[PDB]
Design a protein around this ligand. Structure first.
Ligand SMILES: [Cu+2]
Length: 102
């Protein structure tokens, strides 16, 4: 799947903010615009440790931002369920989306 992160007008959004993928299908986040962003998954409380490792490996580090020099990030989640992801700089601005894995 492909998700655009931000736009050329500097809005703090994922495009689309809701994606449904198959197990193990990579979703490629690509930066659009000059504002840096990243993607970190929320870890469901109560999640088994296998789902928590997977979601952490599918997340960018705190000190990592997509830039014109690193414009994409690829995440793969194979466990069925729906997961929330957000951008750390603009988490306050409701810059978030959902990933449904079938
Ligand atoms: Cu952002």
């Amino acid at each position: 799947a492909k998700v655009e992160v931000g736009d050329e007008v500097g809005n703090f959004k994922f495009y689309p903010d809701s994606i449904t993928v198959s197990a193990g299908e990579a979703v490629e986040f690509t930066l659009v615009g000059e504002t840096g962003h990243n993607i970190v998954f929320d870890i469901p409380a109560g999640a088994p440790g296998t789902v928590a490792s997977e979601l952490k490996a599918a997340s960018m580090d705190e000190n990592d931002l997509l830039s014109e020099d690193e414009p994409s990030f690829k995440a793969k989640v194979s466990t069925p369920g729906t997961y929330t992801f957000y951008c750390t700089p603009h988490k306050s601005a409701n810059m978030k989306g959902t990933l449904t894995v079938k």
